[PDB]
Tab-separated table of C-alpha atoms in Angstrom:
chain	number	residue	atom	x	y	z
A	1	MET	CA	52.413	-92.433	-7.986
A	2	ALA	CA	54.697	-91.735	-4.989
A	3	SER	CA	55.690	-94.889	-3.015
A	4	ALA	CA	54.195	-95.522	0.469
A	5	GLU	CA	57.689	-94.785	1.925
A	6	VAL	CA	57.936	-91.324	0.247
A	7	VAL	CA	54.486	-90.560	1.659
A	8	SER	CA	55.533	-91.701	5.196
A	9	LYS	CA	58.655	-89.560	5.019
A	10	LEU	CA	56.499	-86.634	3.837
A	11	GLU	CA	54.197	-87.131	6.822
A	12	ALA	CA	57.207	-86.906	9.143
A	13	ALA	CA	58.384	-83.721	7.277
A	14	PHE	CA	54.967	-82.118	7.566
A	15	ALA	CA	54.890	-82.825	11.287
A	16	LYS	CA	58.330	-81.185	11.659
A	17	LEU	CA	57.002	-78.078	9.826
A	18	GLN	CA	53.858	-77.921	11.950
A	19	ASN	CA	55.896	-78.262	15.120
A	20	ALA	CA	58.118	-75.271	14.128
A	21	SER	CA	56.223	-72.191	15.381
A	22	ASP	CA	59.262	-69.940	14.626
A	23	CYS	CA	59.123	-70.789	10.949
A	24	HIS	CA	57.793	-68.241	8.521
A	25	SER	CA	58.951	-69.440	5.104
A	26	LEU	CA	56.489	-69.288	2.192
A	27	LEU	CA	56.689	-73.127	2.379
A	28	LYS	CA	55.237	-73.100	5.851
A	29	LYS	CA	52.621	-70.477	4.942
A	30	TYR	CA	51.247	-72.314	1.890
A	31	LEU	CA	51.760	-76.019	2.695
A	32	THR	CA	48.432	-76.320	4.492
A	33	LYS	CA	47.130	-79.697	5.643
A	34	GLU	CA	44.673	-79.562	2.682
A	35	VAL	CA	47.382	-78.849	0.100
A	36	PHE	CA	49.771	-81.374	1.697
A	37	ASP	CA	47.147	-84.183	1.515
A	38	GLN	CA	46.319	-83.236	-2.092
A	39	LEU	CA	50.006	-83.304	-3.215
A	40	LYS	CA	51.877	-85.831	-1.010
A	41	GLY	CA	51.002	-88.860	-3.253
A	42	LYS	CA	52.026	-87.279	-6.609
A	43	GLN	CA	55.170	-87.927	-8.663
A	44	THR	CA	56.382	-86.396	-11.917
A	45	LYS	CA	57.345	-88.445	-14.981
A	46	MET	CA	60.976	-87.733	-14.176
A	47	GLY	CA	60.401	-89.158	-10.686
A	48	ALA	CA	60.229	-85.997	-8.531
A	49	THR	CA	58.001	-86.072	-5.432
A	50	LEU	CA	56.798	-83.380	-3.071
A	51	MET	CA	59.901	-84.158	-0.986
A	52	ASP	CA	62.130	-82.971	-3.849
A	53	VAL	CA	60.175	-79.665	-3.791
A	54	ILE	CA	60.023	-79.015	-0.036
A	55	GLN	CA	63.065	-80.747	1.615
A	56	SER	CA	65.341	-77.646	1.687
A	57	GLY	CA	62.596	-75.649	3.552
A	58	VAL	CA	62.044	-78.554	5.967
A	59	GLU	CA	65.797	-78.808	6.779
A	60	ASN	CA	66.437	-75.020	6.824
A	61	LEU	CA	63.401	-73.861	8.737
A	62	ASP	CA	64.775	-70.306	8.522
A	63	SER	CA	64.339	-70.261	4.673
A	64	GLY	CA	62.531	-67.255	3.172
A	65	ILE	CA	60.970	-69.352	0.435
A	66	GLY	CA	61.787	-72.996	1.280
A	67	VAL	CA	60.856	-74.692	-1.979
A	68	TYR	CA	62.676	-75.424	-5.225
A	69	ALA	CA	61.415	-76.982	-8.455
A	70	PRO	CA	63.047	-80.432	-9.018
A	71	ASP	CA	61.944	-80.492	-12.670
A	72	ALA	CA	59.857	-78.505	-15.196
A	73	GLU	CA	56.727	-80.647	-14.606
A	74	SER	CA	56.737	-79.823	-10.866
A	75	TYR	CA	55.389	-76.365	-11.609
A	76	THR	CA	52.276	-78.017	-12.997
A	77	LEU	CA	52.002	-81.068	-10.717
A	78	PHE	CA	52.668	-79.217	-7.439
A	79	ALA	CA	50.958	-75.956	-8.511
A	80	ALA	CA	48.592	-76.079	-5.479
A	81	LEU	CA	51.687	-75.325	-3.386
A	82	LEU	CA	53.925	-73.501	-5.931
A	83	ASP	CA	51.350	-71.067	-7.359
A	84	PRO	CA	50.447	-69.279	-4.152
A	85	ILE	CA	54.188	-69.128	-3.284
A	86	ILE	CA	55.033	-67.574	-6.691
A	87	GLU	CA	52.130	-65.164	-6.302
A	88	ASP	CA	53.232	-64.172	-2.782
A	89	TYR	CA	56.859	-63.569	-3.770
A	90	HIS	CA	56.239	-61.913	-7.169
A	91	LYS	CA	54.131	-59.104	-5.784
A	92	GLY	CA	51.372	-58.040	-8.173
A	93	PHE	CA	51.489	-61.382	-10.066
A	94	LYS	CA	47.826	-62.446	-9.686
A	95	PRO	CA	46.189	-65.899	-10.338
A	96	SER	CA	44.566	-64.511	-13.516
A	97	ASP	CA	48.017	-63.137	-14.536
A	98	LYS	CA	50.334	-64.574	-17.165
A	99	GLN	CA	53.894	-64.084	-18.357
A	100	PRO	CA	53.708	-62.208	-21.692
A	101	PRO	CA	55.303	-63.712	-24.807
A	102	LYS	CA	59.087	-63.574	-25.000
A	103	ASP	CA	60.115	-60.081	-26.203
A	104	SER	CA	63.438	-58.333	-25.777
A	105	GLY	CA	61.926	-55.322	-27.597
A	106	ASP	CA	63.465	-52.452	-29.511
A	107	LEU	CA	67.119	-52.443	-28.585
A	108	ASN	CA	67.752	-48.873	-29.731
A	109	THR	CA	65.433	-47.576	-26.962
A	110	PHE	CA	68.211	-48.701	-24.561
A	111	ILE	CA	70.851	-46.072	-23.909
A	112	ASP	CA	74.096	-45.246	-22.122
A	113	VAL	CA	72.445	-44.034	-18.917
A	114	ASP	CA	75.589	-42.179	-17.795
A	115	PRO	CA	77.088	-40.493	-20.885
A	116	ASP	CA	79.153	-38.121	-18.644
A	117	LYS	CA	80.854	-41.042	-16.857
A	118	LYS	CA	80.086	-39.680	-13.355
A	119	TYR	CA	78.011	-42.391	-11.623
A	120	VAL	CA	77.833	-45.870	-13.200
A	121	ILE	CA	80.873	-48.130	-12.673
A	122	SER	CA	79.488	-51.078	-14.656
A	123	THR	CA	76.291	-52.564	-15.953
A	124	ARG	CA	75.227	-56.219	-15.905
A	125	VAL	CA	72.307	-58.220	-17.184
A	126	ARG	CA	71.895	-61.852	-15.999
A	127	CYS	CA	69.293	-64.462	-17.007
A	128	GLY	CA	69.001	-68.220	-16.382
A	129	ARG	CA	67.609	-71.186	-18.329
A	130	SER	CA	66.691	-74.812	-17.726
A	131	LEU	CA	67.186	-77.189	-20.682
A	132	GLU	CA	64.098	-78.945	-22.018
A	133	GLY	CA	64.030	-82.702	-21.254
A	134	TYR	CA	66.316	-82.710	-18.185
A	135	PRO	CA	65.356	-82.741	-14.492
A	136	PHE	CA	66.558	-79.785	-12.466
A	137	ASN	CA	69.416	-80.229	-9.944
A	138	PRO	CA	67.646	-82.100	-7.137
A	139	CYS	CA	66.981	-84.983	-9.542
A	140	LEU	CA	69.810	-84.965	-12.128
A	141	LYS	CA	71.834	-88.175	-12.557
A	142	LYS	CA	75.608	-88.027	-13.018
A	143	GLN	CA	75.283	-89.077	-16.713
A	144	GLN	CA	72.792	-86.240	-17.253
A	145	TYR	CA	75.232	-83.690	-15.703
A	146	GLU	CA	77.880	-84.919	-18.182
A	147	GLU	CA	75.625	-85.010	-21.268
A	148	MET	CA	74.195	-81.595	-20.610
A	149	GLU	CA	77.664	-80.069	-20.079
A	150	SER	CA	78.884	-81.617	-23.349
A	151	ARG	CA	75.889	-80.240	-25.311
A	152	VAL	CA	76.313	-76.831	-23.770
A	153	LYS	CA	80.124	-76.692	-24.099
A	154	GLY	CA	79.697	-77.497	-27.822
A	155	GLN	CA	77.531	-74.450	-28.439
A	156	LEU	CA	79.716	-72.181	-26.329
A	157	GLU	CA	82.922	-73.259	-28.028
A	158	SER	CA	81.179	-72.632	-31.399
A	159	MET	CA	80.941	-68.947	-30.483
A	160	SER	CA	82.853	-66.493	-32.639
A	161	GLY	CA	83.287	-62.749	-32.862
A	162	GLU	CA	82.848	-60.811	-29.611
A	163	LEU	CA	81.603	-64.053	-27.985
A	164	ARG	CA	84.754	-66.097	-28.792
A	165	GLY	CA	86.195	-67.546	-25.599
A	166	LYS	CA	87.031	-70.586	-23.481
A	167	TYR	CA	85.145	-73.194	-21.552
A	168	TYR	CA	86.625	-74.231	-18.169
A	169	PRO	CA	85.179	-77.378	-16.640
A	170	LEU	CA	85.361	-77.536	-12.816
A	171	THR	CA	86.236	-81.230	-13.369
A	172	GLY	CA	90.053	-81.238	-13.670
A	173	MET	CA	90.249	-77.470	-13.216
A	174	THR	CA	93.790	-76.545	-12.202
A	175	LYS	CA	94.888	-74.326	-9.290
A	176	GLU	CA	96.104	-71.773	-11.882
A	177	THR	CA	92.672	-71.577	-13.485
A	178	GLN	CA	90.977	-71.388	-10.101
A	179	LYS	CA	93.147	-68.413	-9.103
A	180	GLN	CA	92.642	-66.713	-12.424
A	181	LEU	CA	88.829	-67.124	-12.345
A	182	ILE	CA	88.649	-66.019	-8.663
A	183	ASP	CA	90.523	-62.878	-9.774
A	184	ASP	CA	87.882	-62.267	-12.445
A	185	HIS	CA	85.095	-63.007	-9.868
A	186	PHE	CA	84.051	-65.760	-12.337
A	187	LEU	CA	84.555	-68.885	-10.091
A	188	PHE	CA	81.741	-70.718	-8.309
A	189	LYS	CA	81.950	-73.689	-5.966
A	190	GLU	CA	79.437	-76.032	-4.321
A	191	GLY	CA	76.192	-74.498	-2.968
A	192	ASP	CA	75.279	-73.280	0.511
A	193	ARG	CA	73.092	-75.203	3.020
A	194	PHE	CA	69.882	-74.146	1.181
A	195	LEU	CA	71.177	-75.737	-2.041
A	196	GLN	CA	72.759	-78.726	-0.252
A	197	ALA	CA	69.494	-79.517	1.576
A	198	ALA	CA	67.768	-79.246	-1.815
A	199	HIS	CA	70.200	-81.916	-3.144
A	200	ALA	CA	71.120	-79.361	-5.767
A	201	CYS	CA	74.911	-80.017	-5.604
A	202	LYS	CA	75.278	-83.827	-6.001
A	203	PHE	CA	78.161	-85.435	-7.941
A	204	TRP	CA	80.233	-82.273	-7.485
A	205	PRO	CA	81.952	-81.015	-9.640
A	206	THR	CA	80.653	-83.306	-12.480
A	207	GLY	CA	79.016	-81.348	-15.317
A	208	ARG	CA	79.867	-77.954	-13.801
A	209	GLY	CA	81.841	-75.418	-15.736
A	210	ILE	CA	82.427	-71.764	-16.588
A	211	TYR	CA	82.679	-70.049	-19.959
A	212	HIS	CA	83.692	-66.474	-20.608
A	213	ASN	CA	84.568	-64.545	-23.772
A	214	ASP	CA	88.096	-63.077	-24.321
A	215	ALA	CA	86.783	-59.587	-23.616
A	216	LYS	CA	85.293	-60.766	-20.263
A	217	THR	CA	81.963	-59.097	-21.047
A	218	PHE	CA	80.100	-62.453	-21.208
A	219	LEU	CA	80.048	-65.274	-18.648
A	220	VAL	CA	78.142	-68.567	-18.413
A	221	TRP	CA	77.902	-70.871	-15.382
A	222	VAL	CA	76.799	-74.406	-16.196
A	223	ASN	CA	75.067	-76.416	-13.449
A	224	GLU	CA	75.664	-73.986	-10.576
A	225	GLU	CA	72.021	-73.529	-9.359
A	226	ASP	CA	70.271	-73.547	-12.721
A	227	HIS	CA	71.395	-75.546	-15.741
A	228	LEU	CA	72.550	-72.211	-17.156
A	229	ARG	CA	73.195	-68.787	-15.678
A	230	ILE	CA	74.133	-66.395	-18.496
A	231	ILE	CA	75.564	-62.973	-17.836
A	232	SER	CA	76.554	-59.991	-19.942
A	233	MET	CA	78.469	-57.107	-18.374
A	234	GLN	CA	80.864	-54.193	-19.008
A	235	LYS	CA	82.330	-51.064	-17.412
A	236	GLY	CA	80.290	-47.894	-17.773
A	237	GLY	CA	76.581	-47.457	-18.384
A	238	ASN	CA	75.770	-48.734	-21.895
A	239	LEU	CA	72.763	-50.886	-21.183
A	240	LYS	CA	72.034	-51.217	-24.931
A	241	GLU	CA	75.412	-52.930	-25.566
A	242	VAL	CA	75.164	-55.070	-22.447
A	243	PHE	CA	71.634	-56.319	-23.133
A	244	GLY	CA	72.144	-56.666	-26.954
A	245	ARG	CA	75.116	-58.998	-26.297
A	246	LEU	CA	73.027	-61.078	-23.859
A	247	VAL	CA	70.186	-61.480	-26.396
A	248	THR	CA	72.672	-62.483	-29.104
A	249	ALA	CA	74.521	-64.977	-26.877
A	250	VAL	CA	71.370	-66.649	-25.546
A	251	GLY	CA	70.100	-67.087	-29.167
A	252	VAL	CA	73.391	-68.827	-30.141
A	253	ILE	CA	73.019	-71.327	-27.256
A	254	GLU	CA	69.363	-71.915	-28.178
A	255	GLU	CA	70.257	-72.835	-31.791
A	256	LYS	CA	70.987	-76.354	-30.512
A	257	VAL	CA	69.929	-76.406	-26.874
A	258	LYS	CA	66.180	-75.805	-26.307
A	259	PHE	CA	65.006	-74.260	-23.064
A	260	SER	CA	62.136	-75.038	-20.773
A	261	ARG	CA	59.399	-72.349	-20.999
A	262	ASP	CA	55.909	-72.301	-19.522
A	263	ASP	CA	53.102	-70.205	-21.139
A	264	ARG	CA	52.027	-68.841	-17.797
A	265	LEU	CA	55.346	-68.760	-15.858
A	266	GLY	CA	57.791	-68.033	-18.698
A	267	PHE	CA	61.257	-69.636	-18.280
A	268	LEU	CA	61.207	-72.355	-15.619
A	269	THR	CA	63.942	-72.150	-13.054
A	270	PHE	CA	65.175	-74.145	-10.057
A	271	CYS	CA	64.234	-71.340	-7.612
A	272	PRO	CA	60.721	-69.847	-8.145
A	273	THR	CA	62.160	-66.356	-7.370
A	274	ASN	CA	63.798	-66.534	-10.853
A	275	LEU	CA	60.746	-67.337	-13.002
A	276	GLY	CA	59.269	-65.440	-16.030
A	277	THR	CA	62.014	-63.281	-17.571
A	278	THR	CA	64.706	-64.655	-15.115
A	279	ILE	CA	66.287	-61.256	-15.648
A	280	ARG	CA	68.347	-59.378	-13.106
A	281	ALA	CA	69.555	-56.141	-14.694
A	282	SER	CA	71.877	-54.068	-12.534
A	283	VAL	CA	74.353	-51.252	-12.288
A	284	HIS	CA	77.140	-50.664	-9.773
A	285	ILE	CA	76.508	-47.004	-9.160
A	286	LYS	CA	78.094	-44.175	-7.112
A	287	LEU	CA	75.343	-41.984	-5.553
A	288	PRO	CA	76.720	-39.403	-3.022
A	289	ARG	CA	67.576	-38.514	3.888
A	290	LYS	CA	67.842	-41.980	2.387
A	291	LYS	CA	65.321	-40.659	-0.164
A	292	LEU	CA	67.251	-43.309	-2.114
A	293	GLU	CA	64.763	-46.011	-1.059
A	294	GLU	CA	62.017	-43.505	-1.897
A	295	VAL	CA	63.004	-43.135	-5.583
A	296	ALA	CA	64.101	-46.802	-5.856
A	297	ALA	CA	60.717	-48.100	-4.648
A	298	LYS	CA	58.817	-45.776	-7.024
A	299	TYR	CA	60.716	-47.273	-9.976
A	300	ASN	CA	60.567	-50.889	-8.719
A	301	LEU	CA	64.317	-51.018	-8.047
A	302	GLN	CA	66.314	-52.953	-5.406
A	303	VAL	CA	69.201	-51.144	-3.697
A	304	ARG	CA	71.871	-53.536	-2.250
A	305	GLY	CA	78.375	-44.593	-1.267
A	306	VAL	CA	78.491	-47.270	-3.986
A	307	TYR	CA	75.345	-49.314	-4.611
A	308	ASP	CA	74.235	-52.271	-6.609
A	309	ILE	CA	70.801	-51.381	-8.043
A	310	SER	CA	68.558	-53.785	-9.975
A	311	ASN	CA	65.000	-54.435	-11.212
A	312	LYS	CA	62.655	-55.980	-8.567
A	313	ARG	CA	60.198	-57.454	-11.088
A	314	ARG	CA	61.010	-60.629	-13.105
A	315	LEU	CA	57.613	-62.228	-13.729
A	316	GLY	CA	54.474	-60.757	-15.342
A	317	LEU	CA	56.393	-58.371	-17.642
A	318	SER	CA	58.495	-58.988	-20.818
A	319	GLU	CA	62.291	-59.192	-20.977
A	320	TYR	CA	62.171	-55.750	-22.595
A	321	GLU	CA	59.982	-54.283	-19.843
A	322	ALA	CA	62.204	-55.724	-17.091
A	323	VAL	CA	65.450	-54.196	-18.483
A	324	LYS	CA	63.544	-51.025	-19.374
A	325	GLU	CA	62.303	-50.654	-15.762
A	326	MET	CA	65.965	-50.713	-14.638
A	327	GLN	CA	66.859	-48.124	-17.265
A	328	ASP	CA	64.021	-45.765	-16.264
A	329	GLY	CA	64.829	-46.237	-12.509
A	330	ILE	CA	68.537	-45.492	-12.942
A	331	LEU	CA	67.944	-42.426	-15.141
A	332	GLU	CA	65.579	-41.148	-12.426
A	333	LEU	CA	68.088	-41.950	-9.649
A	334	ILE	CA	70.726	-39.967	-11.592
A	335	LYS	CA	68.222	-37.094	-11.980
A	336	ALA	CA	67.445	-37.237	-8.237
A	337	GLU	CA	71.204	-37.240	-7.471
A	338	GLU	CA	71.801	-34.095	-9.549
A	339	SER	CA	69.040	-31.936	-7.979
């Protein structure tokens, strides 16, 4: 399937990896000679090769992960490399393990986690989606950037009610709009060296754009890293409202634009660290030893005094369970704080 020249270039890439003793990416760990020989000759129907999976990790030897998926099929075709990487990164996600069915659960079990208004500045839930039938960034053509943006923009501009808002393409975006979106923290620009070496940012800014609702409690980035990054957010701690709005908005997009989902991996994403639910649920929280990392770890939460605290787990649990882990963690952090 892959040409002789792709294979030659892959041989050169593998030698570069093997030479690099200082490299400890998951790429380096799991791209064994055996796995490399098994996979080097394969090519997906959309035309992706092992080079389109591993090139960022070969160019940026200091990558943590060092692989991206160039299309949905890659997760199946290059599984001998991708599966042990996913399993390494998503701790506790075993080979016999599977993403559960999609389930956002009972929304009225979500609460305002800070009804006294003392700790939580704002609450955010983000997810991402790839659209069915399109390659991911490393392999998108310019026409495909444009078509996808048009399809997406259509749905977003159809939104009404609390979701009513405006789509801003990066293509022809004025200085005024740039400034305004920067002020909202809504602007993105071309990717860093990890994305660039993945060929994730070609034809910039074609097919890239930003949508937000009038209330500024809902934001979509089109073609930034994934086809879609979809975010709901507001001031205060009402996780119910934040997550309910996300579920609603994603359903509206999906009315016309179908997403790429795997039975085992859930929603397929450009970076394997985003698989499964794709969900990152967080609060910006004021919590004045560091028995902060004690509690946080017990409740599977990441802490990145004003903190940004989010769920660690994205794969091997439902959407509901992911947002619910953040809820439980935060309530327990607030209880720890008040002792």
